[PDB]
Point group: C2
Chain length 108, copies 2
Amino acid sequence: QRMGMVIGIKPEHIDEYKRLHAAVWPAVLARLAEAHVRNYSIFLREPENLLFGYWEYHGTDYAADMEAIAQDPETRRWWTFCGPCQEPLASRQPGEHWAHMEEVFHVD
Amino acid sequence: QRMGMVIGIKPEHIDEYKRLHAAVWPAVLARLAEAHVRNYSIFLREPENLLFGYWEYHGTDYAADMEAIAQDPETRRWWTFCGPCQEPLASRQPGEHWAHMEEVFHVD
Protein backbone atom coordinates (compact mmCIF):
# COMPACT_ATOMS: atom_id res chain seq x y z
CA GLN A 1 0.00 0.00 0.00
CA ARG A 2 1.81 3.12 -1.38
CA MET A 3 1.21 6.77 -0.42
CA GLY A 4 2.19 10.11 -1.92
CA MET A 5 1.88 13.45 -0.15
CA VAL A 6 2.82 17.07 -0.83
CA ILE A 7 3.60 20.19 1.18
CA GLY A 8 5.15 23.57 0.47
CA ILE A 9 8.46 24.72 1.93
CA LYS A 10 9.48 28.31 2.78
CA PRO A 11 12.55 28.96 0.59
CA GLU A 12 14.50 30.71 3.37
CA HIS A 13 14.45 27.41 5.35
CA ILE A 14 15.49 24.93 2.62
CA ASP A 15 19.07 24.55 3.88
CA GLU A 16 17.92 24.07 7.48
CA TYR A 17 15.32 21.51 6.36
CA LYS A 18 18.02 19.69 4.36
CA ARG A 19 20.43 19.75 7.33
CA LEU A 20 17.81 18.26 9.66
CA HIS A 21 16.99 15.49 7.22
CA ALA A 22 20.62 14.52 6.70
CA ALA A 23 20.54 13.22 10.30
CA VAL A 24 17.06 12.35 11.52
CA TRP A 25 16.87 11.38 15.19
CA PRO A 26 17.22 7.56 15.13
CA ALA A 27 14.25 7.10 17.48
CA VAL A 28 11.97 9.10 15.17
CA LEU A 29 13.05 6.72 12.42
CA ALA A 30 12.42 3.84 14.83
CA ARG A 31 8.96 5.20 15.67
CA LEU A 32 8.27 5.15 11.91
CA ALA A 33 9.41 1.56 11.41
CA GLU A 34 7.20 0.75 14.43
CA ALA A 35 4.21 2.17 12.51
CA HIS A 36 5.09 -0.10 9.52
CA VAL A 37 6.27 2.76 7.24
CA ARG A 38 9.05 1.63 4.86
CA ASN A 39 10.93 2.93 1.80
CA TYR A 40 10.13 6.55 2.77
CA SER A 41 11.66 9.28 0.59
CA ILE A 42 11.24 13.06 0.40
CA PHE A 43 12.03 15.06 -2.76
CA LEU A 44 12.38 18.86 -3.15
CA ARG A 45 11.34 20.94 -6.16
CA GLU A 46 12.79 24.48 -6.64
CA PRO A 47 11.60 27.10 -7.59
CA GLU A 48 8.05 25.84 -7.01
CA ASN A 49 9.11 25.13 -3.40
CA LEU A 50 7.32 21.82 -2.95
CA LEU A 51 8.18 18.66 -0.98
CA PHE A 52 6.88 15.32 -2.26
CA GLY A 53 6.79 12.46 0.21
CA TYR A 54 6.59 8.82 -0.84
CA TRP A 55 6.35 5.77 1.44
CA GLU A 56 5.00 2.20 1.50
CA TYR A 57 2.81 1.29 4.52
CA HIS A 58 2.67 -2.43 5.45
CA GLY A 59 0.34 -1.95 8.44
CA THR A 60 -3.35 -2.72 9.00
CA ASP A 61 -5.01 0.42 10.46
CA TYR A 62 -3.43 3.53 8.93
CA ALA A 63 -5.32 6.22 10.86
CA ALA A 64 -4.47 4.37 14.08
CA ASP A 65 -0.72 4.04 13.52
CA MET A 66 -0.58 7.68 12.36
CA GLU A 67 -2.22 8.83 15.58
CA ALA A 68 0.25 6.58 17.41
CA ILE A 69 3.24 8.49 16.01
CA ALA A 70 1.49 11.82 16.55
CA GLN A 71 1.66 11.68 20.38
CA ASP A 72 5.03 9.90 20.82
CA PRO A 73 6.66 12.76 22.76
CA GLU A 74 9.97 12.67 20.88
CA THR A 75 8.44 12.71 17.39
CA ARG A 76 6.36 15.64 18.64
CA ARG A 77 9.60 17.38 19.58
CA TRP A 78 11.09 16.62 16.14
CA TRP A 79 8.14 18.22 14.34
CA THR A 80 8.83 21.48 16.22
CA PHE A 81 11.87 21.77 13.88
CA CYS A 82 10.33 20.53 10.57
CA GLY A 83 7.07 22.52 10.80
CA PRO A 84 8.44 26.08 10.77
CA CYS A 85 10.32 25.16 7.56
CA GLN A 86 7.06 23.98 5.97
CA GLU A 87 4.07 25.72 4.37
CA PRO A 88 0.97 23.52 4.35
CA LEU A 89 -1.08 23.84 1.18
CA ALA A 90 -3.88 26.40 1.44
CA SER A 91 -6.00 23.91 -0.55
CA ARG A 92 -5.49 21.08 1.99
CA GLN A 93 -8.26 19.31 3.93
CA PRO A 94 -9.18 20.21 7.53
CA GLY A 95 -6.86 18.32 9.85
CA GLU A 96 -4.17 17.83 7.18
CA HIS A 97 -0.61 19.03 7.44
CA TRP A 98 0.82 17.22 4.39
CA ALA A 99 -1.76 16.96 1.60
CA HIS A 100 -2.55 13.51 0.32
CA MET A 101 -2.31 12.68 -3.38
CA GLU A 102 -4.23 10.23 -5.55
CA GLU A 103 -2.31 7.40 -7.15
CA VAL A 104 -3.21 7.20 -10.85
CA PHE A 105 -0.62 4.69 -12.03
CA HIS A 106 1.50 1.85 -10.74
CA VAL A 107 3.66 -0.88 -12.24
CA ASP A 108 5.85 -3.20 -10.14
CA GLN B 1 18.77 4.38 -7.08
CA ARG B 2 15.49 6.35 -6.67
CA MET B 3 14.06 9.19 -8.79
CA GLY B 4 11.32 11.74 -8.24
CA MET B 5 9.95 13.97 -10.99
CA VAL B 6 7.11 16.47 -11.42
CA ILE B 7 4.99 17.86 -14.26
CA GLY B 8 1.79 19.87 -14.52
CA ILE B 9 -1.47 18.51 -15.93
CA LYS B 10 -4.20 20.46 -17.77
CA PRO B 11 -7.30 19.98 -15.62
CA GLU B 12 -9.64 19.43 -18.59
CA HIS B 13 -7.59 16.29 -19.45
CA ILE B 14 -7.35 14.69 -15.99
CA ASP B 15 -10.04 12.09 -16.75
CA GLU B 16 -8.44 11.15 -20.06
CA TYR B 17 -5.01 10.89 -18.40
CA LYS B 18 -6.49 8.66 -15.67
CA ARG B 19 -8.25 6.48 -18.28
CA LEU B 20 -5.00 5.96 -20.20
CA HIS B 21 -3.05 4.98 -17.11
CA ALA B 22 -5.64 2.47 -15.92
CA ALA B 23 -4.58 0.35 -18.92
CA VAL B 24 -1.08 1.16 -20.16
CA TRP B 25 0.00 -0.64 -23.32
CA PRO B 26 1.86 -3.79 -22.15
CA ALA B 27 4.72 -3.10 -24.61
CA VAL B 28 5.37 0.29 -23.02
CA LEU B 29 5.44 -1.35 -19.60
CA ALA B 30 7.76 -4.03 -20.98
CA ARG B 31 10.23 -1.57 -22.53
CA LEU B 32 10.28 0.23 -19.16
CA ALA B 33 11.28 -3.01 -17.44
CA GLU B 34 13.84 -3.41 -20.25
CA ALA B 35 15.39 -0.10 -19.12
CA HIS B 36 15.50 -1.38 -15.50
CA VAL B 37 12.69 0.89 -14.22
CA ARG B 38 10.74 -0.68 -11.34
CA ASN B 39 8.23 0.24 -8.60
CA TYR B 40 7.06 3.19 -10.73
CA SER B 41 4.11 5.20 -9.41
CA ILE B 42 2.40 8.41 -10.50
CA PHE B 43 0.32 10.53 -8.11
CA LEU B 44 -2.09 13.41 -8.86
CA ARG B 45 -2.59 16.55 -6.79
CA GLU B 46 -5.74 18.71 -7.31
CA PRO B 47 -6.29 21.72 -7.40
CA GLU B 48 -2.58 22.45 -7.91
CA ASN B 49 -2.73 20.16 -10.97
CA LEU B 50 0.63 18.45 -10.46
CA LEU B 51 1.78 14.92 -11.31
CA PHE B 52 4.52 13.41 -9.11
CA GLY B 53 6.39 10.43 -10.54
CA TYR B 54 8.48 8.01 -8.50
CA TRP B 55 10.53 5.01 -9.69
CA GLU B 56 13.60 2.95 -8.72
CA TYR B 57 16.23 2.42 -11.44
CA HIS B 58 18.40 -0.73 -11.14
CA GLY B 59 20.42 -0.02 -14.31
CA THR B 60 23.96 1.26 -14.71
CA ASP B 61 23.66 4.04 -17.36
CA TYR B 62 20.48 6.07 -16.83
CA ALA B 63 20.91 8.63 -19.61
CA ALA B 64 21.49 5.81 -22.11
CA ASP B 65 18.46 3.68 -21.22
CA MET B 66 16.28 6.80 -21.21
CA GLU B 67 17.03 7.49 -24.86
CA ALA B 68 16.63 3.79 -25.59
CA ILE B 69 12.99 4.16 -24.53
CA ALA B 70 12.73 7.54 -26.24
CA GLN B 71 12.94 6.23 -29.84
CA ASP B 72 11.23 2.83 -29.31
CA PRO B 73 8.45 3.49 -31.84
CA GLU B 74 5.64 2.13 -29.65
CA THR B 75 6.58 4.25 -26.63
CA ARG B 76 6.74 7.29 -28.91
CA ARG B 77 3.21 6.51 -30.08
CA TRP B 78 2.12 6.18 -26.43
CA TRP B 79 3.52 9.62 -25.58
CA THR B 80 1.39 11.17 -28.35
CA PHE B 81 -1.55 10.58 -25.92
CA CYS B 82 0.06 11.53 -22.55
CA GLY B 83 1.82 14.70 -23.70
CA PRO B 84 -1.27 16.70 -24.66
CA CYS B 85 -2.70 16.04 -21.17
CA GLN B 86 0.49 17.36 -19.57
CA GLU B 87 1.89 20.84 -18.91
CA PRO B 88 5.67 20.86 -18.59
CA LEU B 89 6.95 23.16 -15.85
CA ALA B 90 7.91 26.60 -17.15
CA SER B 91 10.86 26.43 -14.74
CA ARG B 92 12.21 23.18 -16.22
CA GLN B 93 15.70 22.66 -17.71
CA PRO B 94 16.26 22.71 -21.49
CA GLY B 95 15.65 19.20 -22.77
CA GLU B 96 13.37 18.27 -19.87
CA HIS B 97 9.75 17.23 -20.17
CA TRP B 98 9.22 15.99 -16.60
CA ALA B 99 11.36 17.98 -14.15
CA HIS B 100 13.92 16.32 -11.90
CA MET B 101 13.53 16.68 -8.14
CA GLU B 102 16.28 16.48 -5.54
CA GLU B 103 16.11 13.75 -2.94
CA VAL B 104 16.55 15.25 0.54
CA PHE B 105 15.60 12.29 2.72
CA HIS B 106 15.47 8.53 2.65
CA VAL B 107 15.03 5.66 5.09
CA ASP B 108 14.57 1.98 4.17
